[PDB]
Design a binder for this molecule. Structure first.
Ligand code: HEM
Ligand code: HEM
Ligand code: HEM
Ligand code: HEM
Lengths: 141, 146, 141, 146
């Protein structure tokens, strides 16, 4: 569970992301494609080339969802219900891949927010992504 | 593999008693029922709405036999699983887009089916050797992903 | 989330375990130690030899806790508070390991309860051990 | 360890810029703080109650430097990690009783640390080379477990 501290940390770090969320979302994807090639099996229909608009388009969607979970940090299960349904029933992404994306998201933020990516913030962002992942995987079985 | 001649012999000898037809259908069906998300690759099989529906689905049972088939033949190249599953590895990646994690889920299901079937016979030491084979198989199959 | 069918299936299967839970506890540990030798890192103080009383005793301990969990299938978080604590603040077993004991527990039930280890029961028990695992690692951070 | 020559050059060029003293302390400290369960091996290190207490603890800093020290040596024998790390793998198993999953967590933290420090220089492709390396090291450190 996220503590007040955690919540503050997350809103703060995410606050800084601002308008770059989209691009950081796309970057996290690319990192993931490159470091964990097995994740690619879920996007057989995508152009995964560098600077792919499909990836850009997708990075934005993911970032909007994370931004939505931060805005509703006290009611994520409900704020993300729809996405939880989609992932459980249509996409059916194996659970292990959530941890891989989370990781690439953390690398991306670290790479962009040196002043904010403090040990305390890092810890909070990790618990947060873990929670988002848990919600998105809650209706799997 | 990093199997001991002793471990090799245990694997080998239990396998001899296996009906691949039946174990194959049961392993794949159990997979589709315990981890419902693996069904994403078998929509064309039909109704997998219930365990009953999965376990009964002939398409499933038949695919299961094909899979253990290939597995079974791999047990004869235990010293080069890599080389034995190379083409199957490419296929799974490039044509089927199956996440290698699936190979590990099945392996574990396989082990539960063997225990189910052999009771007493499937001892800790024997499970241990099988765990090494299923991991070895999954690794071999995932080897060509890029 | 355990459905009512699930809760039923579980209670049934565990019902058949009866006076053998302790032996099954012990057997699952032995299978874990042999199949996943990295798990032994948490028991340096034990005699991990076959038929060791330390292992038997611990086996009972674990079995008993599962029982108590089946019994409070409806209120796990509360029935296992103490255990969640112990694991999070004292034992600090890495979360990956829970998946390993859960698996060795299925294998053990399967090998002992053939008639009862149906596909639907298999699915239920898995979910159950999963929830038990979630409960025991919920206060980690 | 499928490091393409170009992947190996990239690992090496960046490692040239690292202050192991510094990175070592940050990686270890951050592990102890993001995954507090890992603190189980350091009860003689003193106060690890808060991130400040962890990050600043002279013992953590000194140990981190030792760890990264051994890791750097590893980077000069990318060809023989197993050999390089053999006595260390035995020690972690037999004396320290360190669950190998610990090696993977540190690898990930380390990658985040490198990203933290190098910013834009830690490109997608450079991260991918480092991912193979931390995994190769963790595997080498776990090779003698039994
Ligand atoms: C916290 C992590 C994640 C978030 C926030 C997230 C969110 C989303 C969103 C917002 C969409 C688009 C839905 C729409 O069409 O409106 C989506 C689609 C998708 N996601 Fe997830 N997702 C996450 C994890 C994953 C992972 C780990 C994978 C696989 C590696 C994955 C695979 C997919 C796929 C294949 C689609 C459909 C894409 C398309 O065809 O356009 N997701 N996700
Ligand atoms: C023990 C590991 C496995 C082995 C040895 C194996 C082997 C095979 C073989 C021999 C084929 C025949 C296809 C051909 O030659 O054209 C096949 C097809 C296929 N496999 Fe795998 N497989 C394994 C695991 C899996 C898993 C776990 C899944 C998904 C849950 C999967 C999904 C498929 C699919 C979707 C096909 C295509 C069948 C069709 O054309 O309808 N496989 N596999
Ligand atoms: C299925 C989930 C588990 C349950 C229900 C469980 C239950 C228990 C119980 C009842 C105890 C004894 C408490 C006491 O001594 O009063 C215990 C202790 C312990 N558990 Fe957990 N456990 C689980 C998973 C694990 C796993 C996976 C590991 C490590 C691989 C583990 C490591 C330990 C250790 C090292 C002890 C203390 C042993 C001793 O010094 O006596 N547990 N657990
Ligand atoms: C890159 C991975 C690692 C490397 C290269 C490494 C290297 C080392 C070295 C060189 C030593 C000193 C050897 C000696 O005392 O003779 C050591 C000790 C130790 N390592 Fe590791 N280590 C690694 C990861 C870890 C992790 C992740 C943990 C725990 C989470 C850990 C726990 C310990 C402990 C507890 C000691 C003994 C400290 C003491 O003197 O009390 N190590 N390690």
């Amino acid at each position: 569970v996220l503590s007040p501290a955690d919540k503050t940390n997350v809103k703060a770090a995410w606050g800084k992301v601002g308008a770059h969320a989209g691009e950081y979302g796309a970057e996290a994807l690319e990192r993931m494609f490159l470091s964990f090639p097995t994740t690619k099996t879920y996007f057989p229909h995508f152009d995964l080339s560098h600077g792919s608009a499909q990836v850009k388009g997708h990075g934005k969607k993911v970032a909007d969802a994370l931004t939505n979970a931060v805005a509703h940090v006290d009611d994520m299960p409900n704020a993300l219900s729809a996405l939880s349904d989609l992932h459980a029933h249509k996409l059916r992404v194996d659970p292990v891949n959530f941890k891989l994306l989370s990781h690439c998201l953390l690398v991306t933020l670290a790479a962009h927010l040196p002043a904010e990516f403090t040990p305390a913030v890092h810890a909070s962002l990790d618990k947060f992504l873990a929670s988002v992942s848990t919600v998105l995987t809650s209706k799997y079985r | 593999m990093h199997l001991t001649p002793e471990e090799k012999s245990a694997v080998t000898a239990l396998w001899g008693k296996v009906n691949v037809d039946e174990v194959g259908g049961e392993a794949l069906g159990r997979l589709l029922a315990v981890y419902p998300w693996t069904q994403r690759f078998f929509e064309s099989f039909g109704d997998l709405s219930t365990p009953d529906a999965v376990m009964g689905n002939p398409k499933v049972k038949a695919h299961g036999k094909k899979v253990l088939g290939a597995f079974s033949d791999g047990l004869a190249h235990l010293d080069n699983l890599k080389g034995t599953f190379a083409t199957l590895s490419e296929l799974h990646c490039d044509k089927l887009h199956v996440d290698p994690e699936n190979f590990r889920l099945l392996g574990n299901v396989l082990v539960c089916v063997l225990a189910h079937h052999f009771g007493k016979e499937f001892t800790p030491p024997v499970q241990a050797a099988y765990q090494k084979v299923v991991a070895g198989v999954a690794n071999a199959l995932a080897h060509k992903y890029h």
